[PDB]
Every structure is written in structure tokens, then in C-alpha cells.
Design a binder for this molecule. Structure first.
Ligand SMILES: [Ca+2]
Ligand SMILES: [Ca+2]
Ligand SMILES: [Ca+2]
Ligand SMILES: [Ca+2]
Ligand SMILES: [Ca+2]
Ligand SMILES: [Ca+2]
Ligand SMILES: [Ca+2]
Ligand SMILES: [Ca+2]
Ligand code: NI
Ligand code: NI
Ligand code: NI
Ligand code: NI
Ligand code: NI
Ligand code: NI
Ligand code: NI
Ligand code: NI
Ligand code: NI
Ligand code: NI
Ligand code: NI
Ligand code: NI
Ligand code: NI
Ligand code: NI
Lengths: 329, 329, 326, 329, 326, 326
């Protein structure tokens, strides 16, 4: 395959991730494995791994943790040109990777991070989105801090001025806001969104839309409903069946041109499920940029996000060939 | 929830545990993961993790390994006030954690440990059990050394004088004694025991009681029989189905007020099964102290001991909430 | 056994292994530590009933910090629980000409936001033979100056001996800012622990040629004239590099300086060395050591800490005395 | 059991193996786990682990990596007397251990290794095979370098002169040669071979023999066909069903005295499948030397090679007792 | 920002941890490095637009080497991809009287087999303010002498400053062999980096008493007389052991030597120290440092590298200047 | 090649990493070692047919100890198997003023309980050119004095050269107790390895000023007068700390002392240094080295061991000779 100099931009928070090794709990550990990630950072890293020009937009402190996060992004091919520098700390999360009946557990320590306290003037959206074929954000970001909803609105107005394709992964988190606040903020943003990425909870909570029996017919019906209300070009929906922390079934649906497309369903023994939804989003963006047919978009993105479940950390380490090889069985 | 200053006491041996990492065998390893545990120590650590005043009674050498074992107990909240100090060495076991068709393998090196050589005068049972709501021992202990049966008898006579509730986990080990010696020693102790913890082998071997088809009806019948012979207030019995070293099914039964109560049955991908029976015992003791109904005692203790299978080491790292969350599905 | 009490912030410490920089590492070694926690750990290791007073979140890091303290024998009965997070610092352990480097991430810790009602000083200090605090603590949060004042007034009323390690930090406050808060506290301090730097910035006292015993004796008598301390203990690090330092202490008592043996140390981890000096000085005061034994014992103890990874000593009295006797 | 001073010889390449820990990919890792192995080395290590006099014949460089490989062989009991020393480098392979839908991935770096460039004069086959009861090689070796086919032919002519039993594991690798070149080279060697070890692909590719439905009857028929063409005393065939990188089913067939013998079929959660085929071969050689009946040869070798799947690295760490214990259920 | 360019081979480096020998280890620490890659990493760390030119295989090791370079800020646009493997070296990090030991495994690397068409020098060196190479590179493969000549002719035509680190290696070629290839290259070198050894074997120039400042000044003026370099930079390691060395540099410019402060170093990892000297000297030339500041800055930078695990510096300008100012 | 034989106990050694104390560690590094095992490993590394005689349990630790021995080239043919356990020691590797610390756990090891019938000395020592043992072994168990006597009588009958490393240990026996058992053994010892301490306690010989060459020469001639050894080899550690020591040896032969070069060592792991001195002295005797070459070679070898983690050397003859030649 070939590198494609197609400029893609994502925006949000990247955090230091601290996880004990070997299914140890925080209480018991003499060390933490270190990596860096976040929903929109993980998407950028996917798109860079596929050979596009992925830029991640954020703010990091000028300290060694901010330097490391930036260098981690670059290692995976993500361009860091639009990372603002300043503020007091990097956000952190501690992750206990679960097993069997013990779920994974996250302790967040992200408050008062440099991005959370970012100002509208920190970002030149006209410069950032110049020449961009795509802009991606998630619902995790608006509630992180005071100016963040205004910062996204700034970005989305420029995207719209420039004719840039806009995706959103709804990513509802009850830790961050109530479904009422999420709806108050996110529904207006849907005017700017062309491609919706979600799961069923995200749609009930953030959009207030629901159907009985969530069954392909039901998922097809939900996507029609969101499509009729918001006129999305594409709806991508993830379908996780959480048997335990060790085994999940996984599949996706892509809805476009009025029609649902279901991928193969995989049974996965999980190494690290973190980032799997983001790799779905990455793959769906990638497929749309490449002009994949709708069925192939579903199979490719299911394959990619299945594979992420096998890779330690938040970012995929994947080639196009590896993903296609899985999708092709 | 709240801390409960209810004094609970357990007695036995705590050992240094040496396990290679990553399913390595002893022969191949350049290192050993270090932890400290033992049947009755593990029970104390469970009760401390639930917020009771758990004291573990034992003897350890005055050397850094004895200091570390004591400090490991304290870290988990266990009170070390009644640990006698003296003797020559700490007992050790090496553990190879198995996988799939390869079972876990233990090499013991516990002989001539400070506890094995403990004397009756090492322990002031009147001081130890003053104010105790509960006393717990297991069948692993009597055969460890010369005075240990007399030391337990000393403890049990005081418990009985003070009206302290007494539990025993039979824990038959053929490495330690024959079923004939175990029966000769353990049957007399049953006079002092209020709550029996066992599996089916333990009851056939140590008590000489058995039934065909070990089937809920059969397990219910065995518990009636032991209850009629020894007048136990409670019988808790573990039910492991050992598919491989990687997957087991797990469930428990609590028999009280003439009636059996079976928990949910879990299919577990195992991280570390060591201590799982002890956490059952811990949870059953905890439930009895709290006045849980009989069904809830079974579900809570099944949940807790299931979860132990997911946690590296011998001790649980668990909150009440985590256990209840599992039990409630 | 004798009840001793210290108060301050304990933090999760994260350090790369093997002299790695934060930028290059894929893991951090984990421990828990803090000036006054480290003192309590010292005293616990010497066999005293040491209680550490602080506040931690109800989360696994808070749980692990408290467990670490208990592991070392410290009593955690008076740890308040609540708040949103534990404070953190990241530490690159340096080598040769590259100094160690700390990145602090302690703002908005449960302790920084503690309220005075969180701490029952009458109950905490009942039966206590000693109370230690440091100048790291007051600048950490809005009510900590008042929390410390509550404790010091109760210590005064119960007649409990009081030590303070000045521990000036520029990151946390200004030379002027320290002076406004600490100098009133000296009214209740019996034993001062400090260095040249802390004395200048916090106490407004300075003498030539300290970067010489007579100079050091002079500063200690001037300090003692002004605030009437029973004891002044000063650590004397000669910092050739992050690998090799010369190390000694002075104890000033009964109007006389007492200088320890001078150790040349190849350092494993110097964090907590000052704190083990303070612990050792406290212990030596409780055990009626003569001033010179007090200096040798505290020098030997704090030299040894440099050899032990992490913030807490792992030491016996026999071990400390073996070194001091050479 | 007893040591048996029966001299067995194997020949081929041993490589340095570099694998990231914990299912990490090469791209992401700050380290590599180190071990040494190779098809015929792994066989020698099996036979040494069973208590025979196993010699491995190869060439290694005089550098610390060659010293380490030799010392690794000796640690497992393999005699290194006939290792030639010389050349420029040791061969290497990097291995990513897969999980679930992500397969294991090998990057080879074996070209220009000391063995690849070995000369016929490097080996004194008359000395090497003096007193040997058995000689083993695999199809991986001929294509590694220029003289290697001639070196094997030298060995096989002496084996035949001395009446030494000869086994071959066909081990077809498309990375190394085409099925046409493999057939051109390997078919002539079958004249010297008494015991064939293979899977179905190996037989189609290297021997050009095939049957519909690869079903015990079909596998039995393939073994008859190879037996009628080449007059093999024994055919051992491995049967892997590759569900994912995490779970495989595994069983074997031994065909001798005109009759097939199928082992028990195991479902394995895999730790490290590398070497599993070689342990089968090892076990089949061992069984033949001991005079095991044909069914027992199949059960014992299935058991052993199942167990290898549970052991990190290329070599088994196994006792006779452990294998028999599995086979006996 | 200023575009600087270096060219050579980057390798996977495998080292046992904890002073273990290859024979005893069950793991290797992984990093990526090479003389000129290390220079680019230095310049990237100082904030220049540093591009490293080489060739790597399309495999995960090739991917990881390029990612490591990017992590450190190096631009990888001009890395050609193809070939069969990456070069490797194994490194036992020594201690005290046991020297470090390298086993090379670099033959038949993608770079060793590179062709001249693999590199578009007009595009690579367009806008470049500097081009650095070393004498490690020409002997690595059949076309590398001609590849280097292509680059140097383009550097000359664009008026781009050129540095060369002689880096004589006996494993790779003979004293006679170096001389035939390198001396013609000196025609395009403006800044020479070298040591006593490299100068004797590669340049055919020798002076007594170098195993003394006047001796070192004498060799640098003789070199400068013969080849007319703008700058000569010489590192001066005094190798007591694998643990402790004395370290200084000389910069010779405007017909005068300039000797740095001399550092006594307890070494963490000395690999790449010479390369960080070269990077620091390049950076100092681009920033118009006076000769003496240039020596102090480069000495301080290369001293610091000894404290940092791996081949690349992790350093800021402020950090280097802090040391140099003492 | 020449068959050499040593006898004693090999143990599982468990040490925390990274200068951690036993109390603080969540893992132990694993190796296998013991005085005479370490000697055999040395001789095997020099290319001799070295056999180590002992007894181990039939368990995985016993298996791994024997495998470790084979890895290093040692022949394990004469290891008896049975008994209940392997002996263990735990080792905290110290730093600076904190000495290393050993906790022994060797009682009731398979070797401690060995019987004389376990060892066929006629077969073991047939064709042997050398037999080495140490004074660590006799006190370990009831029959070991008699086992050693069986071996020594057979060595005497076959005319096999005999070395003994006195290795007095206070933990294992008293100064008086050593004397009753060892002095009769001296009748069959040709080469003595010892230190000031071992000579006083075991041999009842003492001289002033040894904590000076003339003092050391005097003790060696007194030893030689009394027991008529062909060679006396004495190691001379000057223990500044657990980090830096000065190191030299003396070989006394033909009625003359021979003192080696003195090495200043930054220590990685000093365990087994004395044993590699003994191995080196044995090797030097078998190869006809002159006394002074014998001292330099053994000093260099044992200096190098200090740089290598674990109990066994990983060394070549060329490596040892390279150091000795400086
Ligand atoms: Ca394709
Ligand atoms: Ca509850
Ligand atoms: Ca790492
Ligand atoms: Ca692991
Ligand atoms: Ca058998
Ligand atoms: Ca380390
Ligand atoms: Ca290792
Ligand atoms: Ca650890
Ligand atoms: Ni582009
Ligand atoms: Ni990274
Ligand atoms: Ni209480
Ligand atoms: Ni612990
Ligand atoms: Ni801790
Ligand atoms: Ni005095
Ligand atoms: Ni044999
Ligand atoms: Ni090995
Ligand atoms: Ni499974
Ligand atoms: Ni890197
Ligand atoms: Ni000048
Ligand atoms: Ni070993
Ligand atoms: Ni030093
Ligand atoms: Ni002489």
C-alpha cells in the first residue's frame, strides 16, 4: 500500500496511563506500566498507523510528562504541530486490568489538567483545519473544562466554513456529566456532524433515542431514526457482549445509504480492551476516506477494533494488511 | 459501609511464597515473585479487608523474612500483636502457576519452621481470645509439628470457656498425614467447632463421612449427616469443577437451620487460585458475624472466593461493594 | 511504649528505574513518602508507637499509602479519609553531574483541602511524648496553618515536646511568606532541624562561609539566642555530585556544637535522608543520649538512609550503632 | 524411572529467540525475553529431559551468543560435544506471541549464520554417529545454506552404514523454498528415513501426496499411502485445529504395523506453542526407543506436546511422570 | 528553524540489564542508535529541524527505529525503506576493571546495501544549514563511499557547512584503508571531530605525549595546516575504568586551543558521549558561540550524556548551560 | 583435558534487585552458588574438565542447580541425588556504609545429610589432577568430616594435588571447633588458600599489623614452617565500604612472597571473589605459571569477578590476561 497525504485532525485530551502489571491491583503493586492515551488521541494514532497525516490537537504542560506524551504520539506517526504547551499538569488515569469476573477499574486523576484549563485563544482553528479532509471529536471532551465546549464550537464552525467532514464518537460517561447536561450540549453540535459513532447507551443517553430489543432489525431501526433526525451520512455502532473481563463478543454495524451492514462477530480473549472503540472510529474514518464500500467498511473496522483488544496500551500497532487478513476470514 | 471493631482471631502458619513469573517453571526462571501467605493468615487478611479487627496468631523468626511476613500482614490491616518471635527459619513454598493441562505445582520447604517448633508457652490464649467474637483454625496446622495439636487444644478450651465462636476449615492434605491420623486428631476437635468449612474430600477423609453422587441433593444429605453427628450451627462447602488449570467452575453451599443454600456457579479464567478456599471461609465468617441471611451468606461468599481467583497472591484485595456487585448478578 | 506523632502529607512517588529519565521510561517504580511520614517511619522502625496524621482519599492509592505506613509499623488510626486524590511526585534519580529532578503533582490533594474539624488534637496528642512537623506543610492548603496551630496549642497544653524541620521550599512559597507563618510557630518549638538555606529564608538569620565549624556553631547560637531552642540539629551535605557526597551533622545543645564523623557516600537514594536525621535526633532525645552520641547516631542513621531505595529507612538500632561505633 | 545411556543425535540450527514480554509487539517494547531454540535442538532437549544421551550437532560462532546457546543446551542436559565452532554470527528470530485473533508473528534474521555457511568438513559423521541408536533431522535444514543438503546426505549415508534409525520431521516452510525444490531435495532423502513425522500440509507439499477430507479414515489412508511408497516403519502426524492464537485443539496419530492410533484430543489455552511439534517428535522417538506399544506412543506423545504448549520457550521442561499423568486421563 | 542533516546507520542495540554478561542474561534491554543518528537526536533535542538520512527494512524493527527517532523529535522523511534486515549490536555495559564489550551483527543491513538512487541529495540538502557524517559509514557497504560523495558534492554546491567525525574503527577497516577514502573527503569538511587515535590512523598525523595541552594544541594546528578546517574538536577521555573517567574537550579555532573544564564521571552509559560532543559543537557553531563557550557547552553536554541510559541524549539547553556555568 | 574435582554444598541464592532490602522486595533474583561450586565453575570456564561433587534433592531446585553448573561447563556426573531440600541463602547486596547481609537457610539440606556411601571416591578421583575443598563443608553435617577424610585418603593414594580454602565461618563453628577437624586435614593439603582471619582461628597462628607486606610474608612462612605447604595464597581486601574496595593478593612459594598489583574496585557483586582467586591459583599451578605471574593472574581474575553479578565468573583466559598485563 501507499502513504496518503490526507490531513486529518482530532481534538481532545491525552493522559498518562498507569497500570499495574500482570493483573495486579493498585494496592499490591511495586510498579506501574506507563503509556499515554485518550479517545481522540487513539483515533489519531490509528489514522497515522494507516499512513495518513494525522494531527492531534491538545494542550500539554511543559514538563517531562507532556514531552513524553508528545513523543509517544510522534513515535506512532501522529504530527504534534498543533499541540499547545502550557498549564500545570498532565491528566492521569490509573487502570487495573481485570480478569474473568473482576472488571477493569479506572481511577481518574485528570482534573485541573492543562487541556481542562485551555482557553479559546490557545488554538488557531483556521490554521489547524487548513487543508483538512476530516475532523474528529468525542463527547468525553466538552465536560472536561470550562472553555472546552466553546473551543469545540470554534473548531466546528471553521470545519463547516471549510467543508471539512466531521465525525463525533458520542462516548457518554456518567462520571463526567448527567444525560441531561450531555443532551443540552451535544444535541446542538449534531448540526455540524456528518458521521456518528456510538453504542446503544450513548444514543439513549446523549440523543434521547431508543428502541425495544437491544437483534439486527432493532439496531437498523435506531440508525434510521438518528439518520432522519440529524441527516448523518454514516452511522457506525459498536456491539459488545461483555461475557467477562476476559471474553467478549464483538461486532459492528455501519449504516449508510439507508442500509445497515453488520460485520462478522468475534469472540475475543482480551489482552487490553482500552482503545477498541477508538480504533473502530479510526477504521471507520479511514474507510470513508478511502471510499470503501459499506460492507467493507464494517468488516475492516470490526477487524481492526477486534485486533486492538489484543494489543497492550491505548494505541493500535497495526498494518492495513493485518486487518484485511482478519476481515477476509 | 463502616469499620466494625469485632475481634477475630486465626492461628496457623504463614510462609514465604516464591513463584516464577509468567507461567515459567522453577527450572527455567532467573527470578521469583515474592509474597507471604497461609490458610489461616489468608482468612485473617480477608476479615481485615472487610473492616473487622483480625489478629493472626503465629510464630516467626527474628530475621528479615519474618519481619516482611509481619509487615505484609499489617499492610492488609491484620493486627500482629500476638505473633510470637523466635526460632530459626520461616517456612517457604515454591509455586509454579499452571496453565491449561499443566497443573500448578508446589514444592514445600516448611519443615523446621519457627511455628512448627513452637511451644505451648509461646501463646497466652487467655490474653489472645479476650473479647474475641470468633476463632478460626484449619486442619493443615495440627500435623505441622510436635506441640501444635496441644497448642490448638489449649486455644479451643479457652475459646469454649469464653463462649467464642469457633470455625474449622478441614483442609485435608495427604502430604501432611494419613486419613487415619487426621481422623484420630480432628474428630475430637469437632466437639469445640460450631461452623465447618470443607469440600467433599475433606469430609470423606477427615470425618469418614460419604454419600453417592458427588448433585445438590447429595451435598445437602452430606451436610445433614455431619450436622447430626457434630451439631454444627453452619456447614459451608466449596464446589470446584477443575476443567483445567486455566478454567474452573466454582460455587458453594451454605447449610444452616436444616437447609441447604446453593450460590450461583461461576466459570472462572483463573489468574491465581491460591487462597480461594480461604476467602470463602473469610467470607462465611464475615457473613455470620454480620447476620446475613443464609442465602446471602452463600452468594456473598461464592462471589468473594470467585473474585480471589482473579487476584495475584494469597490474600484478597477486595471491598464489600465489589463482592456485593458480583453477587447481585 | 512511647507515643510519638507526626503530621503532614504523604505522596505517591513515581520514579523511573535504572537512572532513566521520565521521557524515556515505560514504567515507574512505586513507593509512598513524605517528610513527616518518613520521620514516623523512622521512629516506628526504632520501636516507638509512631502515629502519622494526615488525610487521604478513599481510593486504592490512599489505601496503598496507608498500607505502606502500616507495613513499616506506623499507626494509621488518625488518618482522616476523604477528598478527591492523593498527591504525587515524579523523581528522576540522577547520576554524577546530572542532578535528580522532581516534578510535583500534589495540588488539590485530600490533605491540601483538609479542614480543622478533620483532626481531634486532644485525642491524637493524648499520651504523646513528642510531636514533629515540617515547613513543607503550611503552604500546601488554606487551612493547614490553622490546623498546625490547633495541634501546637494542644501540644503546649499537654506539655508535649515539639520538633520542627524548617524545610524551606521555594516552589511552595517565598522567603517572605515562610517568615510570616513559621516565626509565630517557633514559640512552641523545642527542637529545630534545619540547614543553612532554611535558616536564612525562614528565620532571617545569615552567617559567612557555609556553602567550617565555627561558622556553623555561630549560626546555631544566634538561632538559639533568638528563639531559645533546647536543641539545634543541622545536616551538612557536601554535594560533589548526584553519585558521591560527603555527609555529616551538627547537634547544638547546652550552648555547644557537636559535629559527627564525616561519611563519603556513594548514593543509592538520598530522598528521606534529612528526615531520618530528624527521626534519629528525636529518638536520641527520648532515649537520653548525650549530645555527641546524639550527633553520631543521627549521622550514621541518615548516612544509612542514602543506601536504601525509597523514602523510608529499613533499619534496626543495632545496624545504626554498628556504623556509629567506627 | 532410570537414565538410559542410549545415544541419540539431531542436527540443524539453533537460533537466538527474542520475544517481547506480555503480548507486546516489537514496535512497542523496551525489552526482549531471551532464549535459544530450533526444531532439531528442541528434539534433543526433549530426549535429554527424558534421560537419554542426546547430542545436538550444529555450528555456532565463537562469540557470547554462541556460548550462551551452547550453555542453554547443556543446562537442559543436551551434550554439546559435536558442536562445531566458527563463522560470523548466530541466527536470530524475533517472535511476537499472539492472542486471540492476532496471530503470532515471526521476523527471521537467520541468513549468513555460522551453520548456514557450514562446510562438509566441519562434521565427522563417523565419530558423531558411532554408537548412536537414533538420528533425527527436519526439512527446515537443507534449504538454510549451500552445503547443508550435502552435509545431511553425508550424515544419512553413515547412519545407513551403521544401521542407525533415522527420523525426519518434514517441516515444510514456504519462506525457505518452493514445494517443487522441497520435493526435489526431500524425496531422495526418504530412502534413508525409517520414521516420518509430519502434518497434512507437509505431506501434500513435500511428498506430493494428498486425500479428500482433511476425519480419522482420511488420515489413516494418507499414512498407508506414504507407508506403501516409502516403506516407513512409523508415521506420526500432528493434528492442530487453530481456533485462535489463544485456543487450539490438539491430537496426534501414530501409524505402525498397518494401523492407525489416535490420541486423546486436548483443548489448550496456549502459553507458548513454539516447539510443540518438536516435542511430539521427541516423544515419538522416545517411545520408539522404549518399545512403547503403538497406542501408548500416541497418547504419550500427544500428552507431551500438549504440555509443551504450556511452557514458555522452545524446549520442554517435563518429567516422564508428568506426561504419563496427563496421558492417563 | 534551521534544517540540519546527518547520514549513517542506525542499529537495534541489545544490552543485558544490571551489568550482566550476554552469557548470563534472560533478557536484553532494547534501544536504537548509531553515531550520526545520535547527533541528529542531539540537534533535535536542542530544537533544530534535524533530519536523519538512512535506509531501514520494512519490518517492525525498521518501524521501531524510525519511531524512536521521531519520539526524540528527529524527522524521518528521508529514510529510504527496503532491504532485508536491520543491523544489530549487543552491548555488555562494563564495570570497574571489566570494559564494556560490543558484539557487532550489522553485516547485510538495508543501509549496507543501499544504492545511490535511494537518496535524492538535491531535495535532502535543500535549505540545509549543516550536514554531518562519520567515518563509520563508508566501510559499511559497497556504494556508501559513492553515496557520501554524492551528498558532499551537493553540500558543496549549496554552500552547506560540513562536519565529519573520523571515528576510525579497526573492525571495519585498516588504517591504510581509511586513508584512501577519507582524505579525499576532507576537501569538503569544514569542522573536524576526532581523537588522538583517529587522527593517527585516518589522517597520518602523530605527536608525542597524548595517551598535556601543548601536545593536543600541536596536533590540531598540524591537522589545520594540512586540511584547513574552520574548527577542530577533540574529546579527551582519561579512562581509569568502566565506572569512573575524567572527561574534557578541546575546541581549536582561530588558530588557538580552548580546553574545557574537566569532569570526573561515574558513568551510567557512555555510549553516544562522543556523538553528543559533536552535536553540541554543531549547535554551538550555528548559534555563534565564542570558542571557549563552545568547548564548555560541548563538554557539559557530553558529560551529561554519560548519565543517561541509551545512545541518545534526553537534555534541554537550560540543563547543559546549568552544568557549564559551574 | 585435565580432570579437576571440587566438593561441597551448592545453594539457591535469593537476592533482592537494585540494592533493595529483603523487607522491601516483591521479588528475588535467582542464582545458584557455593564456595567449591564456584571454584569448579572457574576451572570449567578456563577449559578444564571440572567436576563438582555434592548431593541435591530430586526436585526442581536441585534440577536447576545442576543445570546452572552444566551451563557453565561443569560436569555433574558425580552429583548424588536424594534428600529433602536444597540449602538457601538470601543476600542483600549492600552499598556504601551499609554492608551486604546474608540470611542462611541451609540446615537439613540433602548435602548436610549425605552419607559416606553416597560418594565413590576411587571412581570420582580416578585420573584427577586436582582436588579442592573448603572449611565451610565439614561443619555442615554429621558425616561430612568423614566424607572429606574418605576423599582425602584416596587423593593421597592416587597422588592427586590438594588445595583447601580455610574459609572459617563463625555461624557454623567455633574457633576451637575448626581446629580439631582441619589441622588433621592439613596432612593432605598441598596448597593453602586463606585470609588473616582464617589463619588465626583455624590454624592458631597470629601476627601483628594485618587489619603491610612483611607481616603477610611472616604469617605465610610461619604457616609453611608448621604444615609444609607448596603454596600459600592470601587475598588482601581493604574494605573502605560495600561499594569501593582495594584488592590484591599474595602468593607465597619457594619461601618467598609475591604481591600482585592493587586494584581499586567499584563493586557489582563481590560474592565468589575469593573462590575465583582459588580457581585462578589452581589453574596457574596446573599451567606452570611462575609465582609472580600466578599472583597477577589470580588477582586479575578475582578483581574481575567483583564486576560480574552472581557467584560464578563468566570469563575467558584472554580477558584475565588483558587486565593482568596493565
Ligand atoms: Ca489492501
Ligand atoms: Ca452493602
Ligand atoms: Ca520497561
Ligand atoms: Ca509479565
Ligand atoms: Ca513410568
Ligand atoms: Ca535494575
Ligand atoms: Ca530475567
Ligand atoms: Ca517488583
Ligand atoms: Ni503529508
Ligand atoms: Ni510510548
Ligand atoms: Ni478495634
Ligand atoms: Ni506484601
Ligand atoms: Ni510499600
Ligand atoms: Ni557536649
Ligand atoms: Ni551416557
Ligand atoms: Ni537458557
Ligand atoms: Ni478461554
Ligand atoms: Ni525508543
Ligand atoms: Ni579564543
Ligand atoms: Ni543459571
Ligand atoms: Ni566512586
Ligand atoms: Ni619468585
Amino acid at each position: 500500500h501507499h502513504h496518503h497525504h490526507m490531513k486529518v485532525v482530532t481534538f481532545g485530551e491525552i493522559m498518562l496511563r498507569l497500570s499495574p502489571p500482570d493483573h495486579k491491583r493498585i494496592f499490591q503493586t511495586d510498579s506501574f506500566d506507563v503509556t499515554y492515551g485518550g479517545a481522540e488521541a487513539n483515533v489519531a494514532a490509528f489514522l497515522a498507523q494507516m499512513g495518513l497525516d494525522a494531527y492531534f490537537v491538545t494542550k500539554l504542560p511543559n514538563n517531562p510528562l507532556g514531552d513524553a506524551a508528545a513523543g509517544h504520539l510522534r513515535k506512532f506517526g501522529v504530527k504534534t504541530d498543533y499541540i499547545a504547551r502550557g498549564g500545570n499538569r498532565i491528566g492521569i488515569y490509573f487502570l487495573e486490568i481485570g480478569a474473568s469476573q473482576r472488571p477493569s477499574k479506572v481511577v481518574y486523576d485528570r482534573a485541573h489538567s492543562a487541556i481542562s484549563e485551555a482557553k479559546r485563544e490557545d488554538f488557531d482553528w483556521e490554521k489547524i483545519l487548513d487543508g483538512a479532509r476530516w475532523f474528529h471529536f468525542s463527547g468525553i471532551t466538552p465536560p472536561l473544562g470550562k472553555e472546552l465546549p466553546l473551543i469545540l464550537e470554534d473548531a466546528l464552525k471553521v470545519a463547516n466554513e471549510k467543508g471539512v467532514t466531521v465525525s463525533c464518537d458520542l462516548n457518554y460517561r456518567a462520571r463526567l456529566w448527567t444525560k441531561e447536561e450531555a443532551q443540552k450540549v451535544m444535541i446542538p453540535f449534531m448540526e455540524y456532524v456528518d458521521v456518528l459513532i456510538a453504542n446503544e447507551e450513548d444514543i439513549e443517553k446523549v440523543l434521547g433515542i431508543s428502541v425495544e430489543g437491544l437483534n439486527r432489525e432493532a439496531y437498523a431501526k435506531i440508525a434510521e431514526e438518528v439518520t432522519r433526525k440529524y441527516n448523518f451520512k454514516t452511522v457506525g455502532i459498536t456491539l459488545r457482549e461483555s461475557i467477562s473481563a476476559t471474553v467478549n463478543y464483538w461486532s459492528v454495524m455501519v449504516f449508510e445509504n439507508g442500509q445497515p451492514h453488520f460485520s462478522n462477530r468475534y469472540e475475543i480473549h482480551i489482552v487490553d480492551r482500552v482503545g477498541a472503540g477508538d480504533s473502530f472510529a479510526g477504521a471507520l474514518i479511514y474507510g470513508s476516506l478511502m471510499g470503501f464500500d459499506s460492507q467493507k467498511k464494517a468488516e475492516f473496522a470490526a477487524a481492526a477494533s477486534c485486533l486492538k483488544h489484543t494489543i497492550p496500551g491505548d494505541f493500535v500497532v497495526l498494518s492495513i494488511e493485518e486487518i484485511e487478513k482478519l476481515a477476509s476470514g
